[PDB]
Ligand binder design. Structure first.
Ligand SMILES: CCCCCCCCCCCCCCCCCC(=O)OC[C@H](COP(=O)([O-])OCC(O)COP(=O)([O-])OC[C@@H](COC(=O)CCCCCCCCCCCCCCCCC)OC(=O)CCCCCCCCCCCCCCCCC)OC(=O)CCCCCCCCCCCCCCCCC
Ligand SMILES: CCCCCCCCCCCCCCCCCC(=O)OC[C@H](COP(=O)(O)OCCN)OC(=O)CCCCCCCCCCCCCCCCC
Ligand SMILES: CCCCCCCCCCCCCCCCCC(=O)OC[C@H](COP(=O)(O)OCCN)OC(=O)CCCCCCCCCCCCCCCCC
Ligand SMILES: CCCCCCCCCCCCCCCCCC(=O)OC[C@H](COP(=O)(O)OCCN)OC(=O)CCCCCCCCCCCCCCCCC
Ligand SMILES: CCCCCCCCCCCC(=O)OC[C@H](COP(=O)(O)OCC[N+](C)(C)C)OC(=O)CCCCCCCCCCC
Ligand SMILES: CCCCCCCCCCCC(=O)OC[C@H](COP(=O)(O)OCC[N+](C)(C)C)OC(=O)CCCCCCCCCCC
Ligand SMILES: CCCCCCCCCCCC(=O)OC[C@H](COP(=O)(O)OCC[N+](C)(C)C)OC(=O)CCCCCCCCCCC
Ligand SMILES: CCCCCCCCCCCC(=O)OC[C@H](COP(=O)(O)OCC[N+](C)(C)C)OC(=O)CCCCCCCCCCC
Ligand SMILES: CCCCCCCCCCCC(=O)OC[C@H](COP(=O)(O)OCC[N+](C)(C)C)OC(=O)CCCCCCCCCCC
Lengths: 183, 353, 95, 71, 80, 105, 78, 149, 161
């Protein structure tokens, strides 16, 4: 979906010229009565790599924030500031743990995603190493709700759709774990 | 210098990419004319051009340069609008259609979820360029070609559009690059062999190529709409017609033969394993392989465009009208119902991922 | 729309003007003026006048009428009875 | 989806078409360098329509019946 | 300049020129509908816009057929 | 009840909530007249066109002109060219003023 | 996006065929671009004149309503 | 008997596709990777001694609205629309560098300047009749008059 | 520099001077092209392509009808006009281009705030098809009913027998 909107960046500068778009900045911070929070610094690739680990670790805070939105009756952005900060800190903690326990496996995964159009199906080898490392060091398991445990696509042995071009770093790391970990 | 040059190149880098892209298409189109004459020659047991450049490699250059050094015939110098409006519209229509042709994953100038619509819409504009030449013209042979040109459009346009929609319906996407990636496990030639034949027939009709060469039948309408054209207007129309031949040959490779996908997955991995992915040399080779896969499939149908010309006589345009409406349209409309019935029956309705 | 707008006086007036562009004997031309006697027209001179009169009124004398016409009044009667406006294109009428 | 690259290509395509006409207009030798038969606007024997050798009736704006009009 | 009915001069003096004028006028309404729907982020208006394009195409076909037969009647002797 | 004001992704758009509250007020039996629902109708029309808010912006701009206030001193900074959303404007620590790449994402 | 590619060709062919007719249109086009780019306000004055003569609410009419309200509200407070 | 002279033009056409594919696959990938290194030209061009092997980012295709939001968010974090960063905490500059596009909502130029398309009973009323604008100005006037109470 | 203004001015100039029917169908093409391009940017790329797909096919059928009707009428009919008066007419029409008289709506810019609640993102065409085939399926079926009437209608009007 590449529909032009007034809420984000459009397709080309000709659209900006026709719309006379002004990219407006604000130099004012949040008022002091709202406690400050540390924003998440992960880009698109690390966030997609850690999406299921944030959900597993921060499920109760994700639900509580979203339940606050529904029960606010239209006043979600203002009322649920407190619940929003809980999610931001919890999500940051997951990324901090990934940089202290599984940095090599974590970086291997989202760099594969940047190499393969950010598609999960093209980085199974790197994801499997990452999933094993996170479970053994954080007790967090990727789970896809609504389907039986053995019918998860990320655990499929012989997928119909496979990446066209292999990721060399993923291939080398996968072989280093096949022979060593599984003697 | 140095610092002011190492960022000037970055400032103009993407213009070099487009210029290289334009040259890549022009080279194929330029040597398609040479390839067609060489291919027909051996099938007709002649040789084809071999005396213009070493083994005939400069034949395309000589034909273009000689025509670019020819007088432009028009009633008045100010009448440059009349004989140039037609060819320019036809040339712009086919060149803009190449923007959505991906030589690799994401390697297309225009990426959009409506690339299929843009492809068909841009091609339909090229028909308007042909009919412009017959602008209350005093040439009787130019007029007769315009009537035939409109008749051919009514034949293939419905058939060609619906066949492309079936492939889009099977993938539930109007993005060309998504259609290419959806053929990783199966090439659509196997499930839709009748559609590939129908698509190729419509491609021949669209480009006014034999056996559907009624617009430019030398034995019927001397030269058709180009009988009054010379020098640059003839070149632009000649360039546009052959640019459509390459484009339709490339489209056939995309819709039914997986586009740029490798013939063998094992061979693709072995070749790329010889190169380091931390160096740019891997991505230079990767682009050569992926486009090489597209080139081999596209060259086969460009060969087939020449092959059918050297093996089949021309069919009358009134017979073509009955051929598409009585035969092709019922078949394609039958398939557009058959395909969803199969997919729904086995719980395999397509989604975009 | 497609109907004659001629009158006997206007047709006679224009018939006289056409015939005065030739080398006729007399410039006094009326309905009873004969081509052969009063105007002194021979075979070819008479046919030149008839074709010239055809050009003015956009009518075509038939063979029998042209080979038997004697007076100017017969020419006037033929023009009134047979003249029709030329059919226009579809755009001229309904637009 | 960014389309700035696409816009540059469309601009080049439009300019490219004018180059073919501009090159042909600036490459051909002048008429005086050729047989010097004058401008094409005066050479009526050349700018006239082609009818395989013999001139015929001029029917540029005559109606053309079409047998596939219903199709 | 619109209140003096300036558009009546921009329309040509042929029957088919009246047809072209109607297509342009209907196309203006569809463009306006797309303009409103896109701002509102309303797909209902885009459904309306698509319907207006399809319906206007049907109108052109019917009008052309009447004009085709009307031109046929005048050139209908076909004695040759 | 037919769906109106559907977003580009199949769900409600920005102004569906205003429209939904108008329908609920008009079809509620407890009301005797449509006067209580008048304020809800204005909000829905304000959601689409923002005519009152644009009018408020017109007054503030006009009021600042008579006071001599410079627009750049009380306004909001903006950039007109997307390629010039440089890292220096974004406030990055090592931010440079070189143009950003917007040709192909 | 087709007009982007077509525009150079039609403009060049316009001047080649009707140089004087194209010059007047191009000159008129550029004059009203200069008026808007240099903030000369020629088109704004015509728009203000049209709204005033046709009974429309004008920029000055809207501002006068605010002044009347501001004067009234200030008097009420004081 | 395979005629190799007939296959020479096909080999050149084969090289024609490879020229486009080789340049596009490599130059576009290199440009994205170069701009993801940092916000300044001294990092994009100069390669540090302690930096590891270069990891390339391939071009992105088949995007949606979420990817447009991500691209702007990545710009405010790295100075590139596809910048790379796995930091747990963002910089202080990320708090106040948000970009909000403000634009006009006027009708297309063809709708208000075409010699034929702009003429309709409702468009004339909008353009020449003050009945709509006079009534709507009441709502704007009611806003200021309802402040003092 | 809004170049759409210049293109429409050129198109408007030829509308007042168009004489034959071929120049009129050329006006139609010179009208759809600015519409498509202005739709391709700004508002809606989807309907810019839809306009090209449908109207270009109608143009060719329109053009082929002209070849069967032209009857020499406008090849010799004279027109008078005058260069000065034509420019004056276009200049006055150029003076007023404000289709609406809500100055606040035309001069004050607005923004929208995007949200992440729509994790399922698809093109507008899919949403149109979702509603057209489910919510407004009656409209789709009636449109097919109208298309059926046109097919029968064309045959009875045109066919001699
Ligand atoms: C590949 C396999 C062929 C092979 O290796 O040897 C033949 C081939 C040379 O043919 P040849 O050995 O001289 O022929 C044997 C006698 O000379 C002459 O023996 P012959 O001509 O009497 O052989 C006859 C044979 C045809 O000769 C062949 O066997 C060639 C095979 C043709 C069919 C497959 C293509 O049979 C036929 O005539 C029927 C074939 C056609 C039937 C329809 C097509 C079926 C597929 O060897 C090569 O592969 C090198 C040429 C390939 C082109 C290289 C340069 C290309 C230009 C690069 C740019 C510069
Ligand atoms: C052609 C006329 C285009 C006029 C124009 O304004 O183009 C502006 C063009 C845009 O800048 P751009 O090159 O896209 O910057 C990308 C940096 N990564 O930047 C330009 O100034 C383009 C000027 C160079 C293009 C000429 C062709 C270069 C390749 C020649 C071979
Ligand atoms: C920068 C220049 C811009 C120029 C824009 C207009 C271009 C020239 C067109 C001539 C102007 C006529 C149209 C004017 C707008 C339509 C009339 C109208 O709505 O009233 C406006 C005008 C003043 O209105 P006012 O009372 O001051 O304020 C509104 C308060 N509620 O009330 C008026 O008195 C206006 C004059 C209307 C009365 C004379 C016209 C009617 C009588 C002659 C009719 C001739 C045509 C008849 C056609 C009948 C067809 C059914
Ligand atoms: C696209 C690039 C290649 C085409 C470039 C040709 C440029 C010519 C002008 C293009 C149209 C611009 C808008 C004008 C509307 C059509 C008016 C017209 O009939 O064509 C203009 C042409 C000029 O010759 P002229 O003698 O001055 O006019 C006849 C005077 N009795 O008089 C003619 O009848 C000649 C017609 C030749 C065939 C033109 C067919 C229409 C071309 C439309 C394609 C471009 C789309 C419009 C782009 C500009 C939009 C304003
Ligand atoms: C590049 C690969 C193709 C080269 C073929 C070639 O250079 O062709 C040889 C040319 C053309 O002469 P010809 O009579 O067509 O030669 C063909 C011989 N035959 C007839 C036996 C087949 O002769 C020359 O070298 C003279 C000109 C100097 C070199 C100019 C090269 C052309 C410029 C464009 C390409 C760089
Ligand atoms: C008609 C024949 C089509 C054809 O030969 O193409 C069908 C097949 C291959 O394509 P596939 O098996 O359909 O799918 C793609 C299968 N890969 C993954 C191996 C590419 O080609 C050949 O193996 C030759
Ligand atoms: C099991 C499946 C096979 C069933 C075959 C039934 C054939 C009936 C038939 O052909 O019916 C016969 C009639 C009438 O034929 P006629 O030529 O008027 O006279 C018959 C011959 N005479 C003159 C000797 C008597 O044909 C029709 O109605 C023609 C329309 C048929 C459908 C055309 C469109 C196809 C679209 C396909 C879906 C996309
Ligand atoms: C790519 C192909 C390159 C090879 C062919 C180049 C031909 C162009 C050179 C040329 O025409 O040179 C000869 C000319 C003038 O002589 P002319 O014949 O009257 O010019 C006719 C050409 N007009 C129409 C441009 C005047 O000299 C000059 O001062 C060129 C400036
Ligand atoms: C594989 C292959 O053949 O790739 C080698 C290539 C091209 O070979 P080609 O035979 O011209 O490819 C044309 C393919 N056809 C024969 C099917 C049309 O050679 C080079 O120049 C590199």
């Amino acid at each position: 979906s590449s529909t032009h909107t007034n809420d984000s960046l459009n397709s080309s500068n000709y659209v900006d010229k026709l719309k006379d778009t002004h990219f407006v900045f604000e130099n004012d911070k949040l008022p002091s009565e709202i406690p400050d929070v540390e924003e998440v610094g992960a880009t698109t690739a690390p966030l997609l790599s850690a999406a299921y680990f944030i959900g597993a670790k921060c499920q109760d805070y994700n639900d509580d924030f979203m339940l606050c939105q529904k029960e606010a009756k239209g006043n979600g952005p203002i009322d649920c500031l407190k619940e929003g900060r809980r999610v931001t800190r919890c999500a940051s903690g997951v990324l901090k743990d990934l940089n202290t326990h599984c940095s090599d496996e974590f970086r291997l995964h989202w760099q594969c995603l940047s190499f393969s159009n950010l598609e999960y199906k093209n980085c199974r080898k790197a994801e499997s190493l990452l999933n094993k490392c996170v479970f053994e060091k954080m007790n967090l398991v990727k789970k896809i709700p609504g389907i039986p445990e053995d019918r998860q696509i990320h655990l499929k042995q012989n997928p119909v759709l496979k990446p066209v071009a292999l990721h060399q770093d993923s291939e080398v790391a996968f072989k280093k774990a096949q022979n060593e970990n599984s003697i | 210098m140095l610092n002011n040059l190492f960022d000037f190149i970055e400032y103009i880098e993407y213009w070099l990419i487009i210029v290289a892209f334009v040259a890549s298409v022009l080279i194929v189109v330029a040597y398609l004319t040479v390839a067609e004459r060489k291919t027909m020659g051996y099938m007709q047991r002649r040789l084809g051009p071999n005396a213009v450049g070493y083994y005939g490699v400069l034949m395309a250059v000589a034909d273009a340069l000689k025509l670019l050094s020819k007088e432009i015939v028009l009633p008045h110098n100010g009448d440059i609008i009349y004989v140039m409006s037609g060819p320019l519209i036809s040339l712009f229509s086919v060149l803009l259609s190449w923007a959505v042709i991906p030589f690799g994953p994401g390697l297309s100038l225009l990426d959009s979820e409506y690339s299929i619509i843009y492809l068909l819409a841009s091609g339909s504009i090229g028909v308007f360029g042909t009919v412009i030449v017959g602008w209350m013209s005093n040439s009787k042979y130019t007029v007769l070609a315009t009537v035939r040109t409109t008749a051919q459009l009514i034949s293939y346009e419905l058939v060609l559009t619906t066949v492309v929609f079936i492939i889009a319906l099977i993938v539930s996407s109007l993005n060309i690059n998504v259609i290419i990636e959806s053929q990783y496990n199966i090439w659509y030639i196997i499930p839709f062999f009748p559609l590939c034949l129908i698509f190729f027939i419509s491609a021949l009709a669209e480009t006014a190529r034999p056996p559907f060469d009624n617009v430019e039948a030398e034995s019927e309408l001397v030269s058709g709409h180009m009988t009054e054209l010379s020098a640059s207007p003839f070149v632009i129309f000649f360039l546009s017609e052959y640019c459509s031949m390459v484009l339709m040959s490339t489209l056939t490779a995309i819709f039914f033969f997986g586009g740029y996908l490798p013939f063998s997955n094992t061979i693709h991995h072995l070749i790329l394993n010889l190169f380091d992915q931390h160096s740019i040399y891997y991505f230079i080779i990767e682009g050569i392989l992926l486009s090489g896969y597209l080139a081999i499939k596209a060259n086969f149908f460009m060969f087939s465009f020449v092959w059918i010309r050297a093996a089949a006589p021309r069919l009358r345009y009134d017979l073509l009208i009955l051929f598409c409406w009585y035969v092709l349209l019922p078949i394609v409309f039958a398939i557009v119902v058959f395909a969803p019935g199969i997919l729904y029956c086995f719980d395999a309705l397509p989604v975009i991922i | 729309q497609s109907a004659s707008t001629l009158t006997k006086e206007d047709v006679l007036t224009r018939s006289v003007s056409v015939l005065r562009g030739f080398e006729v004997k007399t410039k006094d031309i009326d309905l009873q003026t004969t081509f052969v006697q009063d105007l002194g027209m021979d075979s070819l001179d008479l046919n030149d006048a008839l074709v010239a009169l055809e050009e003015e009124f956009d009518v075509v004398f038939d063979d029998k009428t042209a080979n038997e016409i004697k007076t100017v009044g017969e020419v006037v009667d033929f023009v009134l009875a047979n003249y029709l406006p030329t059919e226009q294109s579809i755009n001229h009428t309904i637009r | 989806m960014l389309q700035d690259l696409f816009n540059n290509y469309v601009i080049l395509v439009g300019i490219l078409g004018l180059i073919f006409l501009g090159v042909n207009y600036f490459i051909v030798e002048s008429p005086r360098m050729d047989e010097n038969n004058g401008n094409i606007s005066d050479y009526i024997e050349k700018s006239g329509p082609f009818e395989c050798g013999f001139s015929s009736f001029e029917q540029s704006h005559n109606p053309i019946p079409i047998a596939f009009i219903l199709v | 300049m619109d209140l003096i009915l300036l558009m009546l001069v921009a329309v040509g003096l042929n029957i088919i020129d009246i047809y072209i004028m109607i297509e342009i006028l209907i196309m203006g309404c569809t463009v306006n509908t797309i303009y409103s729907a896109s701002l509102d982020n309303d797909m209902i208006g885009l459904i309306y816009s698509l319907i207006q394009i399809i319906i206007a195409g049907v109108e052109s076909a019917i009008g052309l057929s009447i004009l085709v037969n009307y031109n046929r009647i005048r050139n209908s002797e076909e004695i040759e | 009840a037919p769906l109106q004001q559907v977003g580009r992704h199949g769900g409600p758009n920005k102004c569906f909530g205003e429209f939904q509250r108008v329908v609920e007020c008009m079809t509620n039996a407890k009301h005797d007249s449509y006067e209580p629902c008048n304020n809800l109708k204005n909000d829905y029309l304000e959601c689409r066109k923002h005519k009152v808010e644009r009018y408020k912006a017109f007054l503030m701009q006009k009021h600042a002109e008579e006071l001599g206030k410079d627009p750049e001193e009380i306004g909001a900074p903006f950039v007109r060219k997307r390629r010039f959303l440089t890292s220096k404007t974004l406030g990055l620590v090592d931010g440079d003023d070189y143009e950003i790449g917007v040709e192909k994402i | 996006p087709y007009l982007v590619a077509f525009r150079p060709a039609v403009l060049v062919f316009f001047f080649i065929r009707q140089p004087i007719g194209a010059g007047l249109l191009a000159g008129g086009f550029l004059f009203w671009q200069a008026d808007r780019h240099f903030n000369f306000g020629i088109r704004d004055n015509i728009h203000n004149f049209k709204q005033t003569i046709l009974g429309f609410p004008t920029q000055a009419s809207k501002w006068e309503t605010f002044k009347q309200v501001d004067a009234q509200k200030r008097a009420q407070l004081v | 008997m395979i005629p190799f002279e007939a296959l020479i033009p096909y080999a050149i056409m084969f090289a024609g596709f490879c020229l486009g594919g080789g340049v596009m696959n490599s130059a576009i990938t290199a440009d994205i990777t170069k701009r993801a290194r940092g916000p300044n030209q001294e990092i994009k061009r100069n390669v540090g001694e302690d930096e590891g092997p270069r990891n390339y980012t391939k071009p992105r295709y088949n995007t949606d609205q979420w990817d447009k939001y991500f691209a702007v968010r990545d710009l405010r974090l790295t100075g590139s629309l596809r910048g790379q960063s796995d930091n747990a905490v963002a910089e202080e500059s990320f708090k106040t560098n948000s970009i909000q596009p403000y634009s006009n909502t006027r009708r297309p130029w063809v709708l208000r300047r075409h010699i034929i398309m702009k003429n309709s009973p409702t468009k004339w009323a909008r353009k020449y009749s003050s009945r709509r604008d006079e009534r709507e100005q009441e709502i704007k006037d009611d806003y200021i008059r309802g402040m003092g109470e | 520099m809004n170049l759409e203004i210049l293109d429409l001015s050129i198109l408007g100039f030829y509308s007042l001077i168009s004489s034959n029917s071929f120049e009129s169908i050329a006006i139609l093409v010179a009208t759809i092209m600015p519409v498509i391009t202005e739709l391709w940017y700004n508002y809606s790329q989807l309907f810019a392509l839809l306009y090209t797909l449908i109207y270009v096919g109608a143009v060719v059928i329109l053009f082929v009808f002209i070849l069967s009707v032209i009857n020499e009428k406008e090849e010799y009919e004279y027109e008078y006009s005058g260069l000065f008066i034509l420019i004056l007419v276009l200049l006055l029409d150029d003076l007023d281009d404000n289709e609406s008289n809500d100055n606040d709506y035309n001069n004050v810019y607005i923004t929208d705030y995007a949200d992440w609640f729509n994790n399922y993102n698809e093109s507008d065409l899919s949403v149109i098809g979702n509603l057209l085939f489910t919510e407004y399926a009656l409209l789709l079926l009636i449109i097919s009913f109208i298309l059926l009437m046109s097919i029968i209608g064309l045959i009875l009007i045109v066919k001699k027998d």
